[PDB]
Amino acid sequence: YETVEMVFIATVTGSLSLVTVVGNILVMLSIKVNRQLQTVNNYFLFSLACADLIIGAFSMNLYTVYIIKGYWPLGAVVCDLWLALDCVVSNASVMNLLIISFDRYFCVTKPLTYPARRTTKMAGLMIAAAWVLSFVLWAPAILFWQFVVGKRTVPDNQCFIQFLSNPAVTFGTAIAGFYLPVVIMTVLYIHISLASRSRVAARERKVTRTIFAILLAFILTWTPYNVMVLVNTFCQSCIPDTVWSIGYWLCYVNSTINPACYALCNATFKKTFR
Amino acid sequence: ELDQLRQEAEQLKNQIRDARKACADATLSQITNNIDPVGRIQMRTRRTLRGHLAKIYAMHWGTDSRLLVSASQDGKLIIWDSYTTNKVHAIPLRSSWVMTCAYAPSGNYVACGGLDNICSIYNLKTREGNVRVSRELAGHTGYLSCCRFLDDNQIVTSSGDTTCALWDIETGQQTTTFTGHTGDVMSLSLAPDTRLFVSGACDASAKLWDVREGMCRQTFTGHESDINAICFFPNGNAFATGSDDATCRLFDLRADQELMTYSHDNIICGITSVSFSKSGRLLLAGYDDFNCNVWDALKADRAGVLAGHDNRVSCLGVTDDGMAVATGSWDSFLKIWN
Amino acid sequence: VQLVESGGGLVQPGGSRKLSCSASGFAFSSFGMHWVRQAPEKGLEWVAYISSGSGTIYYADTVKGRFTISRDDPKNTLFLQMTSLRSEDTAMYYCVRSIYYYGSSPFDFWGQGTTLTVSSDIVMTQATSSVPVTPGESVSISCRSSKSLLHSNGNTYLYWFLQRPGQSPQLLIYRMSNLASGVPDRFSGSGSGTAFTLTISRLEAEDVGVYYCMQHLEYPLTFGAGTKLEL
Amino acid sequence: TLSAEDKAAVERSKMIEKNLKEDGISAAKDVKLLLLGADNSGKSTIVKQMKIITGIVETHFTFKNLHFRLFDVGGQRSERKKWIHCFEDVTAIIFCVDLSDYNRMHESLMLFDSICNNKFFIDTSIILFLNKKDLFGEKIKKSPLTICFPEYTGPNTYEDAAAYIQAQFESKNRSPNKEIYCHMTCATDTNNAQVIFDAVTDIIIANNLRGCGLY
Amino acid sequence: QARKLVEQLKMEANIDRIKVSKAAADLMAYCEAHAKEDPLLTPVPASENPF
Ligand SMILES: CN1CCN(C2=Nc3ccccc3Nc3ccccc32)CC1
């Protein structure tokens, strides 16, 4: 590497990392400063903004050091928390996308009774379930693994998920973190397009177009990482580091485009940003 | 003939304007160009009364500066304790299409009316411990836009049938009927002496009536659209009108013409409510642009803006002691500003 | 407005008895309810209180753990479940209605109670016990308080009740200076912190009886000894 | 909230606060519709089972676990602009047009244009009922559809004539988020509350989709 | 009838009007007389402010 190259790499990421904190903190403000955009549905977008903000402030900024330096300069206790934070806050973002699909599914399939039955308190229970499930599935596994798994295994100049050696645990976490909440999301969003038809068109065409924007973005920006991790256990030294970074960065491009795919679909949100 | 009577009316109208121009030696801005302005009034929301779930169209302070009744489309009148933010009473309404409400000076009754063409009187102080309907006043043809208590037995109502009325609550019959307006009467203000009252209708005109003998004394015409709000000066010798032409105008009875106009190039929305301060120096008016504007009644210059409502401000009210101003709006909330 | 009490009688010591009051003529869902005793040769004594909606329940220190207060709004009835009766529980129990909002008149109505035969706190002092008066003179009745009844909100809480012979007490003045509905305007009350007086101008018949001063600043509610006017 | 009586006043306010919640919750299931049209246009007989609860006439009927509130404003012979904002929160507007009343049909066109383009009803859907369809077929046999619309160059049949009137009424709509619905029923179609129910159900789905951000 | 307008205009065409400058002076004097009793104009201290 060289001084020019490392400045060039930092500038691309630093400007891109600014997009996430400008894309999301707004969304939080727009809910607060606008009473019209203060509803139960928009409260779900607030939770997704929190997941994107943490990634944009802690995860993708600490990975700049890893690629620029080429090793891990910080200690081991701090990286035990960074990986735990990334593996939990990213799961929360996936779950906030799942409860948005569930909320949208019921508001269209049962438009008469669901919006009244589902109160503010019920939304908070669902929102808290996303974060509670995030801690249980990941935090004990990564933060307290080597302690109960034959001491450590990662050197002091590198940092990676340690339980990737076991194919059983890798399948368990990958299926329960990305693969399951995608199958449900695609199934639910197919039915919401069928339920947008005018039973008794210009409405179902626009709705289906927005669904493809949400689903295709999510698949193209999370699948490569969850596919390399699956083959990582089977064939240990077979995925080059030139595509690990490519497959890792794309998981963070989702946090940048999440306000565009969800928040920047209403005219009200577009007006607020002006 | 019809033409013969037409010429006489034109001559009387021309004669009135001739006398109007004869008494306009100098505009009010000319004489009020040498006293210090009020500066910049910066009031803040001190209370926020929550509990209404629909648009608020009317409110009225009681004669103690602590109790106020608010009317909303949810079909309920709520009496508030503005000091503690407490709901003293919640009165369900037979008709949810309410556009006016009044508080009796004695505090024992409240008034309500709207698209049902009926003014309803409620007895707040009962031996049974509940608020019940005491009377239902019927006879108006159009919607009832305003009502104002005179005492526990007399009330004045303005309706959309171009007519105002005076009622005896015990008898339930119209003692007096006021006729002469061409458009729907929208607002109604009682003089402090109670012997006179002024109303503003949709014919872009305001008329001064006396309750004693029920004949129109003065007619004012300076506006270009519907008159939505009216309120007397504390002196009782003047009143202010808010209209759909985004303008406020001040009229004086003895001079019998307009004295001052309140407008801005950046205001293109009509006025929903008007009110004066205790001394009459401040003219508070609610507008359709989600805001309430404070005006200098002697300078025709804005002194402050009350911007805390997320919908149209439909109500205004200044307490008897002048300590607080309560503003109701379509956003189902009403705030107290001091 | 009518409150009718039921129950009471000859009860042996250590037994249990339930007293019931039936309410008619007013709304028995917005009025707080009270129980007040009166010994055969003594003054009034507060017992228990239940709020509208059965939210707050209070008891006197001499009946806590033995007395229970309950209401059934659909049946328009108040209950007082008494257990472990002692010889000191022999009194006439009165049911009192009370409403609470800005400008209310608490303790407005009393019901003719049923007698029972069983065989810190603010101190209210009424030194005067017997006062001979003439039909037309002006008299004053004084009451004293250990604490200052004046509150920071400008509301000081003193109550005046008149109990004519063979009748339940009725409210005359609420909050040191306020006249009750149906009370003649000749009755007037005034005072300050820890000092109170009640003036009866142009005394006549039907004004003879025992006058009690009661404080509502905080629970438990305490009465006075009682000032008796004799013709 | 310090003194004994002050605490009991707060408890009363909370009890009133509670009762306001159920009353608002119970009123949320109601569907508010606004009935409009020319005088004597079948406005009061759109549904056979409608039952009244002279300013405003409120009629209520529950079709399928859904309470419908219908408000007729014809007795308010005054300026509509001063009280029409009270119905800004209605789910939809039901407009009735007499296909037989040739003289009153131009008045219906003027009335229909104002309600569609009123500033309050910019996103309020409109269910359109073309009444007197049975009499329309009998009427066109004697008087053709040329007196009302001199610019009509088309067949003198019933189906073609009906479409021309319907197209004219739908031409007054300009906003693309209103979704006018059309239906023809004169006097005998007992199932005329189903079409309102289906239209309202369609309207709520579009509102929910816009609230969800998908539309 | 058209005579109703003439009778009404006749009553309002003969009123003992005064000048605007005299009318303006009355309102100007009223505001200055009650300036000290206008809480909106001069904000009250928090000790004597119920809100
Ligand atoms: C960019 N980072 C990378 C790390 N992350 C996740 N790594 C995993 C590690 C092992 C097996 C599966 C996964 N897949 C995930 C599924 C759900 C939530 C997080 C992950 C977060 C994003």
XYZ file of N, CA, C and O in Angstrom, chain A residues 67-142:
304
model
N -8.827 -2.921 7.252
C -8.367 -3.016 5.871
C -7.199 -2.071 5.618
O -6.279 -2.397 4.859
N -7.216 -0.888 6.234
C -6.130 0.068 6.034
C -4.839 -0.453 6.659
O -3.775 -0.437 6.031
N -4.917 -0.928 7.903
C -3.719 -1.404 8.588
C -3.278 -2.764 8.063
O -2.076 -3.031 7.948
N -4.232 -3.634 7.740
C -3.932 -4.991 7.343
C -3.942 -5.996 8.472
O -3.887 -7.203 8.207
N -4.010 -5.538 9.720
C -4.104 -6.406 10.883
C -5.051 -5.758 11.884
O -5.646 -4.709 11.617
N -5.196 -6.387 13.047
C -6.025 -5.828 14.102
C -5.123 -5.180 15.141
O -4.464 -5.898 15.907
N -5.054 -3.849 15.211
C -4.120 -3.209 16.146
C -4.648 -3.161 17.570
O -3.868 -3.189 18.528
N -5.967 -3.089 17.723
C -6.566 -3.045 19.046
C -6.439 -4.408 19.723
O -5.961 -5.386 19.142
N -6.881 -4.474 20.975
C -6.754 -5.675 21.771
C -7.722 -6.762 21.349
O -8.234 -6.785 20.226
N -7.972 -7.682 22.278
C -8.882 -8.794 22.047
C -10.217 -8.642 22.755
O -11.226 -9.143 22.255
N -10.246 -7.971 23.907
C -11.510 -7.743 24.601
C -12.385 -6.779 23.810
O -13.610 -6.940 23.748
N -11.775 -5.765 23.192
C -12.548 -4.786 22.433
C -13.131 -5.414 21.172
O -14.270 -5.121 20.790
N -12.371 -6.289 20.506
C -12.895 -6.941 19.312
C -13.910 -8.023 19.648
O -14.748 -8.353 18.802
N -13.846 -8.586 20.856
C -14.900 -9.491 21.297
C -16.235 -8.768 21.403
O -17.292 -9.384 21.227
N -16.207 -7.464 21.681
C -17.416 -6.653 21.744
C -17.833 -6.127 20.377
O -19.031 -6.042 20.087
N -16.864 -5.766 19.530
C -17.189 -5.267 18.198
C -17.886 -6.332 17.364
O -18.889 -6.057 16.695
N -17.365 -7.561 17.390
C -18.009 -8.645 16.658
C -19.363 -8.987 17.266
O -20.321 -9.273 16.541
N -19.457 -8.968 18.598
C -20.742 -9.189 19.250
C -21.735 -8.091 18.897
O -22.910 -8.367 18.635
N -21.280 -6.835 18.890
C -22.161 -5.729 18.532
C -22.637 -5.853 17.091
O -23.827 -5.687 16.801
N -21.716 -6.152 16.172
C -22.085 -6.288 14.766
C -23.041 -7.454 14.553
O -24.014 -7.338 13.798
N -22.788 -8.585 15.211
C -23.624 -9.764 15.016
C -24.971 -9.657 15.716
O -25.831 -10.516 15.494
N -25.177 -8.642 16.547
C -26.452 -8.429 17.226
C -27.244 -7.300 16.582
O -28.436 -7.446 16.310
N -26.595 -6.161 16.329
C -27.306 -5.026 15.753
C -27.717 -5.310 14.313
O -28.745 -4.806 13.844
N -26.937 -6.115 13.585
C -27.336 -6.492 12.233
C -28.535 -7.430 12.256
O -29.418 -7.337 11.397
N -28.566 -8.320 13.253
C -29.724 -9.239 13.404
C -30.971 -8.401 13.699
O -32.039 -8.717 13.138
N -30.832 -7.368 14.536
C -31.968 -6.514 14.864
C -32.528 -5.846 13.616
O -33.749 -5.788 13.432
N -31.650 -5.358 12.736
C -32.107 -4.742 11.496
C -32.896 -5.731 10.649
O -33.912 -5.370 10.045
N -32.441 -6.983 10.591
C -33.176 -8.010 9.860
C -34.545 -8.238 10.488
O -35.555 -8.362 9.785
N -34.603 -8.294 11.821
C -35.880 -8.524 12.489
C -36.815 -7.325 12.372
O -38.032 -7.507 12.264
N -36.281 -6.099 12.397
C -37.139 -4.941 12.166
C -37.710 -4.945 10.754
O -38.810 -4.428 10.531
N -36.988 -5.521 9.793
C -37.557 -5.715 8.466
C -38.631 -6.795 8.474
O -39.572 -6.738 7.674
N -38.509 -7.784 9.362
C -39.505 -8.849 9.425
C -40.798 -8.365 10.067
O -41.892 -8.739 9.627
N -40.701 -7.533 11.105
C -41.908 -7.027 11.751
C -42.560 -5.915 10.943
O -43.760 -5.663 11.108
N -41.806 -5.239 10.073
C -42.419 -4.315 9.125
C -43.258 -5.080 8.110
O -44.372 -4.669 7.767
N -42.741 -6.209 7.621
C -43.508 -7.035 6.694
C -44.751 -7.606 7.363
O -45.825 -7.655 6.753
N -44.625 -8.050 8.616
C -45.789 -8.543 9.347
C -46.815 -7.438 9.568
O -48.021 -7.664 9.424
N -46.354 -6.240 9.933
C -47.267 -5.118 10.124
C -47.969 -4.782 8.813
O -49.194 -4.620 8.772
N -47.206 -4.698 7.721
C -47.796 -4.382 6.426
C -48.739 -5.484 5.962
O -49.776 -5.206 5.350
N -48.387 -6.742 6.234
C -49.216 -7.857 5.790
C -50.598 -7.809 6.424
O -51.608 -8.035 5.748
N -50.665 -7.517 7.721
C -51.945 -7.509 8.415
C -52.766 -6.265 8.103
O -54.000 -6.324 8.124
N -52.112 -5.136 7.820
C -52.845 -3.914 7.508
C -53.517 -3.967 6.143
O -54.384 -3.132 5.864
N -53.142 -4.915 5.294
C -53.748 -5.067 3.979
C -54.673 -6.277 3.925
O -55.756 -6.205 3.344
N -54.266 -7.394 4.533
C -55.109 -8.585 4.527
C -56.307 -8.436 5.455
O -57.383 -8.969 5.164
N -56.144 -7.726 6.568
C -57.240 -7.421 7.489
C -57.260 -5.920 7.744
O -56.888 -5.452 8.826
N -57.693 -5.132 6.756
C -57.670 -3.672 6.923
C -58.709 -3.153 7.896
O -58.602 -2.001 8.331
N -59.708 -3.962 8.251
C -60.819 -3.468 9.056
C -60.503 -3.517 10.546
O -60.764 -2.552 11.274
N -59.941 -4.629 11.020
C -59.792 -4.862 12.452
C -58.362 -4.763 12.964
O -58.171 -4.404 14.127
N -57.358 -5.075 12.145
C -55.982 -5.084 12.640
C -55.477 -3.710 13.068
O -54.883 -3.615 14.156
N -55.640 -2.632 12.290
C -55.086 -1.340 12.732
C -55.635 -0.860 14.062
O -54.941 -0.131 14.781
N -56.863 -1.243 14.416
C -57.414 -0.858 15.710
C -56.972 -1.813 16.813
O -56.668 -1.376 17.929
N -56.937 -3.116 16.522
C -56.534 -4.092 17.529
C -55.083 -3.895 17.948
O -54.764 -3.925 19.143
N -54.192 -3.687 16.983
C -52.773 -3.508 17.268
C -52.549 -2.088 17.772
O -52.536 -1.136 16.986
N -52.372 -1.944 19.082
C -52.196 -0.647 19.711
C -50.713 -0.292 19.791
O -49.842 -1.011 19.294
N -50.428 0.847 20.427
C -49.044 1.278 20.600
C -48.273 0.311 21.490
O -47.110 -0.007 21.214
N -48.908 -0.173 22.561
C -48.233 -1.088 23.476
C -47.863 -2.394 22.788
O -46.775 -2.937 23.014
N -48.759 -2.921 21.947
C -48.467 -4.164 21.241
C -47.295 -4.002 20.282
O -46.504 -4.936 20.110
N -47.162 -2.828 19.659
C -46.015 -2.577 18.794
C -44.713 -2.601 19.582
O -43.708 -3.152 19.118
N -44.710 -2.008 20.777
C -43.503 -2.002 21.587
C -43.075 -3.394 22.011
O -41.880 -3.684 22.101
N -44.044 -4.268 22.288
C -43.717 -5.653 22.612
C -43.048 -6.349 21.433
O -42.083 -7.101 21.611
N -43.551 -6.112 20.219
C -42.936 -6.705 19.036
C -41.560 -6.106 18.767
O -40.631 -6.823 18.378
N -41.413 -4.793 18.959
C -40.124 -4.148 18.729
C -39.085 -4.659 19.718
O -37.947 -4.964 19.344
N -39.459 -4.765 20.996
C -38.524 -5.260 22.001
C -38.174 -6.724 21.772
O -37.083 -7.164 22.150
N -39.081 -7.491 21.162
C -38.794 -8.893 20.881
C -37.667 -9.034 19.866
O -36.884 -9.988 19.925
N -37.576 -8.095 18.921
C -36.510 -8.144 17.925
C -35.139 -7.993 18.571
O -34.195 -8.709 18.218
N -35.008 -7.063 19.520
C -33.721 -6.856 20.178
C -33.436 -7.948 21.201
O -32.284 -8.370 21.359
N -34.467 -8.412 21.911
C -34.277 -9.487 22.881
C -33.816 -10.759 22.182
O -32.902 -11.449 22.650
N -34.434 -11.087 21.045
C -33.997 -12.246 20.275
C -32.592 -12.053 19.719
O -31.862 -13.032 19.533
N -32.201 -10.806 19.442
C -30.862 -10.549 18.923
C -29.789 -10.887 19.952
O -28.759 -11.479 19.610
N -30.007 -10.513 21.214
C -29.023 -10.789 22.257
C -28.847 -12.288 22.467
O -27.724 -12.799 22.479
N -29.959 -13.009 22.623
C -29.896 -14.413 23.022
C -29.168 -15.247 21.977
O -28.329 -16.093 22.311
N -29.471 -15.026 20.698
C -28.960 -15.915 19.662
C -27.477 -15.685 19.391
O -26.774 -16.620 18.987
N -26.976 -14.472 19.617
C -25.615 -14.119 19.233
C -24.700 -13.811 20.410
O -23.580 -14.330 20.462
N -25.141 -12.978 21.355
C -24.227 -12.473 22.380
C -23.578 -13.572 23.214
O -22.346 -13.538 23.377
N -24.305 -14.553 23.767
C -23.602 -15.639 24.473
C -22.673 -16.435 23.574
O -21.639 -16.930 24.038
N -23.019 -16.574 22.293
C -22.238 -17.421 21.399
C -20.866 -16.820 21.113
O -19.849 -17.519 21.171
N -20.815 -15.525 20.800
C -19.552 -14.929 20.379
C -18.775 -14.375 21.569
O -17.548 -14.515 21.639
